[PDB]
Amino acid sequence: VYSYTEKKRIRKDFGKRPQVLDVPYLLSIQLDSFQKFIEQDPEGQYGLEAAFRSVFPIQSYSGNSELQYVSYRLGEPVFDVQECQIRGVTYSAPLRVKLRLVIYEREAPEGTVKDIKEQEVYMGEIPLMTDNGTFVINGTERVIVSQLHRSPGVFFDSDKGKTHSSGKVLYNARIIPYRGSWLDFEFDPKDNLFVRIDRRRKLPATIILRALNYTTEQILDLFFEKVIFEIRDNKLQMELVPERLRGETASFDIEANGKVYVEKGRRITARHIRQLEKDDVKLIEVPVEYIAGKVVAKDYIDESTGELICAANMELSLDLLAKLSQSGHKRIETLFTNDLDHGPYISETLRVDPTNDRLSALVEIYRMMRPGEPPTREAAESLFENLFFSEDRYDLSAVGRMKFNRSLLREEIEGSGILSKDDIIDVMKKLIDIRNGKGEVDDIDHLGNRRIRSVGEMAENQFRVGLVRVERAVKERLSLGDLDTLMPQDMINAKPISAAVKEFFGSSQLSQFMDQNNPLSEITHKRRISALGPGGLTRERAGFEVRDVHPTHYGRVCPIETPEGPNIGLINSLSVYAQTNEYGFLETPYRKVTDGVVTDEIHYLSAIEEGNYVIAQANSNLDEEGHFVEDLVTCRSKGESSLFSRDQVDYMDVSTQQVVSVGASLIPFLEHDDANRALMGANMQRQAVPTLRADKPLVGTGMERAVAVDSGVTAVAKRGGVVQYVDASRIVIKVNEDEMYPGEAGIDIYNLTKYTRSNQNTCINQMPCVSLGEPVERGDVLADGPSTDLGELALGQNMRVAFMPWNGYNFEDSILVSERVVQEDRFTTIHIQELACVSRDTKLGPEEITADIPNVGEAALSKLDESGIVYIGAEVTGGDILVGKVTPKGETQLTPEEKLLRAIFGEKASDVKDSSLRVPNGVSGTVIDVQVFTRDGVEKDKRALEIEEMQLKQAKKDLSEELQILEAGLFSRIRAVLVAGGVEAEKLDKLPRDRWLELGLTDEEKQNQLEQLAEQYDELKHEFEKKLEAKRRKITQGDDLAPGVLKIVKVYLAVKRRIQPGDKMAGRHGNKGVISKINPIEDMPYDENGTPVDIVLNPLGVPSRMNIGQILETHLGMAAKGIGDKINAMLKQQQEVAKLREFIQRAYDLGADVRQKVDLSTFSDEEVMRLAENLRKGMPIATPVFDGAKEAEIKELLKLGDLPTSGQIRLYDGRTGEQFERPVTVGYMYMLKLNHLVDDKMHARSTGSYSLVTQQPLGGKAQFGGQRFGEMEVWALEAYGAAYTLQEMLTVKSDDVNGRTKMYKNIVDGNHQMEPGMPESFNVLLKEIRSLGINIELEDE
């Protein structure tokens, strides 16, 4: 079945596999993250509620007064999104928080307070996310890219041998908190465990253990096992645990029960260990040499002296053993320090450090943190307590605690945000275990270790950063305030919150100017994952570790859609089906496989969870019941693809597209393209400019419709219904009774956005795609925005392409375009440009927008009105004055003699100069809009008055139109209701449509419905009047302009760039090219039928650049057009519907095992005609990204038409008329007109403004700058003998003021000779060196 919208044009689908999971809402991440930031959460886990409950309540430093929290609310936006874009203000909501302040009197901890004062205090504005996932901050739409940082937790790395120049692999364990201080436990070549906080300086690890109030003997007991020596009679009978004997050599003869298990010298083998374990040997006799090297566990005291004889961590010797022999110690504890499994790392760390007591540890840590300051006991204690244990200054977030528990093999996943003694001990023990040899270090690039911050989370973080400062201010004020005088308004200052929030949304590395020149560009900019930004990496630091594709990127990140440049692999793009876990980790769908049957229930799996599973590949054959037909299927168990049997399969890939993103999923025959060329093809689809008319890609992938609909460029019908009205700038849909809510009536109005500027100076324009009385279903597109045809993404145009060299005009990558392409204006683009003239209040008086422009005749000012502003619709070219402003800020006043001399010359120059915003040279077009923003109290001019009057009239007209449309719907509903139970029809037209409150109806719910409709009418009228008043107030009031600017005049030109040589064009498979010639139509190659080819490409670009996908596409495109041709042949000459539907059905049934199966028997011979009309320009074909059409199907489709199966036809030369031998490949390929137009690149300068510090030419073309003769260019000129050229290049042409002025005068005089001089930048260098204590001088000859 088809819902009357995709039935207009059914895209022939070649996908073999059946779709299981519909493509999710592509903008889900942004909208969901922001919705869970402002939405009220009773649990307080998310967003502003969490921030308030974490900060509030606030008490003074003592228990004097308390400020607590009740709730918060978002006020209505002051201006609409479009109004904000026009005016330039942020689209934000006021944040009003109900705060109550309580007062505690003398000895009233829990008793009734003196007073409670509650007020709804205003705390800054918070920017709002529009329906498309974008923010309007200062009139420009901005996108906050999601960040991919290291998850909080504990991570163990290696620094594998790059240090110490000996190959030893050190080991480091970092405890990364969400908000706090970094703690690192590092090893050294001597295998001593050291610690460092915030990577300041490395100090022994045991110090912090002592800082946690641990005694040395307790530390040794904690980190080591204990060996017991018993002095029963002699020889120190040792308690031996046999499993501890493995891994070393028996230094003595081991014997028990008269059985020498291991002889002297020989090492202990496995068999000996088994025998000892089964023999139940507990105590053994040992020699005296063995204990000579052990370390005593804990301290011992002598009974006689009562003092110490041996302390903890002391290498026992004969002397110490003798000393403790007579003291009465028979049981001696030592540390089991195996050479290769239980290292003495803690023992060496304890020995090396100079710290023995807790206070010494605390002062050492204080001096490390605060170097030089006089330490204090309380200061050091407080510093250490606040480092990792204060809830306010340290917080392992919930995800952080979860990861911390997971990495330590704990059981629970919930804990405290702060660390603990047990946590640090466990981290150290795990690091020591890693050092020993058991366990493995973590890999940072694993996607299970990297989170996904979104706009909501970062906004919450910045809001909390503002709120902590607000808390500090409130706490400070609570101490010095007369409590019973002030409400909680002066107590709270909103400046910190607004400052932080607006400084994050406006000036941040992740809040970026949106790339808006395509639905694809926007939708893939919003689904962007950046490893950079605050808390992330930097493009100059990370290298060749996060750039590479990890095995865990499968299904969670696109490996091919990444930018090429300084940051490659750091700006990863989210995959099509990838979602974000509850904790922020990327997870992807998978079909569950319980038994051998593939169940149709979807489980979302994260990297760590997916690791311990075997997932069958997407391209696995299944039957009707669902069974892996092949005995062995290809799966991937632990990031390692291999072959597994039919039963172990635990999961299957939901779709074949899930490995790529929404950028690379739009490339047909992706699998045949080199991955680099897929990357470039996606990057270049992101740059295509919307042409005049969309052209419905003939060879798509089925993701065009999803991309177009999900991106907020179309007008998707909110509710199904019937198109009641449709014009160029509005749609009105009468909703069906089934979907109609009770009461309000209830017809949807869609106001299409007409020609308006985009962030890239493209054109945003929505055109209706429905007619009057045409049924529409829910979710169907009514109007299609830029680069869209009938709801399908159409970034470029498909046209006839031939692959062959043509007289060198397609030499390297150049494209030869026929004059027919430019004649049809198919690649003609509309670019809207904004020019702002600002009149300011400067010194020497203000600026004026008068039309009395000096030094210019009336001819140049003809196009301006009486107020000095251009007319709307005037065709302006380069140099024309758009808004001529001339200011009293002119020149100085002339002294009596000076003024008399000036007047004697006969000149009436006044004190008014010419600024006069004019069109940039080389830019033409038509003026489509003029907006005058006037500051409060400036006496707006006549043009501003006219604009405001027109705007007020238009606002009234649109409001009245909406009101009467809704009321026509309401009256129609009322009339429909009246048709039963006392219907009046003959006399219903006699009385006016208004006087329907006095009618006669029986007693039922219908009269109640009529009353509800009447009340809806009354409230609609009231809100109508109020809305009109509000719009008039907003239009008539002034504008909050910048400080010191009088008024702004913004003129919108609309240039139309058709096509020309130098305009870069590319396909979808990384194939570029600048047009080299607009060839005449009669000069192009033509086939037997005389149809010329629109474009000629170079075949040599296909083998060198292994993008075979174009050729296949071309062939398929040809086939597609062939089908359309036949339909056109069956349509231009009218033919019976039977034959037409028969041919269409045969075309749609062509395939191997396609799963589309469109049946035309249920079209009613009237939708078939519309389908044929849509298919007469070639049948659209869908080629899924990795489930595409095989070559055999392409040959079959070619043969269905009258086209050769080879895909190559015979062409004749347009010039000579002679046949080209070697039949050439001709088809239909999808060209894109990338946003690199030659007229935006061409630049030239002979003389212009020069920089200030160094008198060199300015840089760039926005300022009339010169090209940089780089250092390598200087080397190149030195390689020649070009000494004079170089000298004039760097002296007379760049920075010799006298030299360049004289050279210019000589050129004008006709003499081409230069005086070399000395560069000014050299003098600048000399002075800069002299600004130091260095005396550099140019000594005489």
Partner: protein, 552 residues
């Protein structure tokens, strides 16, 4: 410098100088009233820190940061580094009389001229136009001449044509890796917005026409113009400065055209007939009576200058083809005939140009290169050499080679699991056997591809070198080599990670076939390597060449 609004630019030196005067004045005031030793000591320390920050910020530690928390650029920071005076304003400077624009092909140009747009030509040569206008009396005052130029009157264009006649312009591409990245051309005024760049010089510039932009500079003085004309003209840079080989060798379309022209097949139209000269060959080919590649006999007169500089004619009957005879009309006199009696790949054409240069001179070589470009373009257009999907024929030996390699890796893995070999040597053995299998597949592909065509209509079958488009372009050296055609038709082999680590898992499918999801995931590792080495490891080559230049 005033910023938008009343606020001035937040300069860096001013802040540092202005917080050194602060400490100095504070310390002077304290010493005036004899403040306690501790306070004056701390003030002296702060003054020392401020002066150290002013002279070289961040050298001592705690680089003081202004608003926006960016360390201030001190004097040391201004004179040193890549952004300092030496490497930003003294060794390389911005220059007037310079423009930039996208480049196009313009095959019609000669080697010594480049197509300059009329608009950039007018904008660059404004002072020269003013001088000509004053000389011809069309504008007495420079204001009048400027007004005439900005209106683009019909008469200033004639001035522009008159002043562009013999005024070379330097054309420079951005990465001027070697001295041929900046070369002088005679401008030809073009109606457009893109610079037309001669096809032959592209190889020197490394300038493809897929969006590349180039910069035009105008020599001003007579010395500079003569240096451009006599040192930097593209017709003087025939030989690369790094080696002796020519640098203006025709790149991809010309070589393909010449390869197609100079070639033979066992049976074509007009085969075996005896021709009276190259002119007859061209007449026959244009008339359609003989194929461009058909074995014939042609009376060729070649000039040998083995005498004391005297060209001696020698007439003989060469067994050749129609295309070879036609091409012989372009070769100059002194060259032998055998120089055009081969297939004329890219290396053959390069050797041809080199020999012409060594034997005849410079001007004959320039003319020969221009004629080679023209004829190659024309006959490549005539050939209609296209690329299809049926041209990447898959070998029938690919599957069995793959199976044998898989059996080898299976047996090596079996040995490894038994402990006979360790992980590193197992990995090395797997890599080597996969490389051997890939080489075998490539060899079988090329064997099946080169002799693919067997053609006969006059008797028994006779094998010949194939006319396949992919092979015809690979053999000619136009574009691609064994590796890329191998990836197209044969198995594409092992990949390498960005850190120069080889993924032991190969890719068993070519590009004509699928490359399923798993295979298109191993490939992305190699693609990431290739793009990272382009954007991250180019700093090493640039640093090395800068060191080499600055030592020598």
């Amino acid at each position: 410098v005033p910023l938008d609004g009343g606020r001035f630019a937040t300069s860096d030196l001013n802040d540092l100088y202005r917080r050194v005067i602060n400490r100095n004045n504070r310390l002077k005031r304290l010493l005036d009233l004899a403040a306690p030793d501790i306070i004056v000591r701390n003030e002296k320390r702060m003054l020392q820190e401020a002066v150290d920050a002013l002279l070289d910020n961040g050298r001592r530690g705690r680089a003081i940061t202004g608003s926006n928390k960016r360390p201030l650029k001190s004097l040391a920071d201004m004179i040193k580094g890549k952004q300092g005076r030496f490497r930003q304003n003294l060794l390389g400077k911005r220059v007037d009389y310079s423009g930039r624009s996208v480049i196009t092909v313009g095959p019609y140009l000669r080697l010594h001229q480049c197509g300059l747009p009329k608009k950039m030509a007018l904008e660059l040569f404004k002072p020269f136009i003013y001088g000509k206008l004053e000389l011809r009396g069309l504008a007495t005052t420079i204001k009048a001449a400027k007004k005439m130029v900005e209106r683009e009157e019909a008469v200033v264009w004639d001035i522009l044509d008159e002043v562009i006649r013999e005024h070379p312009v330097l054309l420079n591409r951005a990465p001027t890796l070697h001295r041929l990245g900046i070369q002088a051309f005679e401008p030809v005024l073009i109606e457009g917005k893109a610079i037309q760049l001669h096809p032959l010089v592209c190889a020197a510039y490394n300038a493809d026409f897929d969006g590349d932009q180039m910069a035009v500079h105008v020599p001003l003085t007579l010395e500079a113009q003569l240096e451009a004309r006599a040192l930097m003209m593209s017709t003087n840079n025939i030989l690369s400065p790094a080696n002796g080989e020519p640098i203006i060798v025709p790149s991809q379309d010309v070589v393909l055209g010449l390869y197609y022209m100079t070639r033979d097949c066992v049976n074509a139209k007009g085969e075996g007939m005896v021709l009276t000269g190259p002119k007859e060959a061209e007449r026959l080919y244009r008339s359609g009576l003989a194929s461009l590649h058909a074995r014939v006999k042609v009376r060729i007169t070649e000039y040998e200058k083995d005498a004391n500089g005297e060209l001696v004619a020698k007439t003989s009957l060469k067994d050749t083809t129609v295309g070879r005879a036609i091409l012989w009309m372009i070769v100059p006199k002194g060259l032998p005939y055998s120089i055009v009696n081969q297939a004329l790949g890219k290396k053959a054409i390069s050797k041809m140009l080199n020999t012409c240069y060594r034997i005849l001179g410079l001007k004959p070589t320039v003319i020969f290169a221009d004629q080679i470009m023209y004829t190659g373009f024309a006959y490549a257009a005539r050939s209609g050499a296209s690329v299809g999907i049926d041209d990447m024929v898959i070998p029938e030996k690919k599957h069995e080679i793959i199976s044998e390699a898989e059996a080898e890796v299976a047996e090596i893995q079996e040995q490894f699991q038994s402990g006979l070999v360790t992980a590193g040597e197992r990995y090395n053995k797997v890599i080597d056997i996969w490389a051997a299998a890939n080489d075998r597949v490539s060899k079988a592909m090329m064997d099946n591809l080169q002799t693919e065509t067997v053609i006969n209509r006059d008797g028994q079958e006779e094998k010949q070198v194939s006319f396949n488009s992919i092979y015809m372009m690979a053999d000619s050296g136009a574009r691609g080599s064994a590796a890329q055609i191998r990836q197209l038709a044969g198995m594409r082999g092992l990949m390498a990670k960005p850190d120069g680590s080889i993924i032991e898992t190969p890719i068993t499918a070519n590009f004509r076939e699928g490359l399923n999801v798993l295979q298109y995931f191993i490939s992305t590792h190699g693609a990431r390597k290739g793009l990272a080495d382009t954007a991250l490891k180019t700093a090493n080559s640039g640093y090395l060449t800068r060191r080499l230049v600055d030592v020598a």
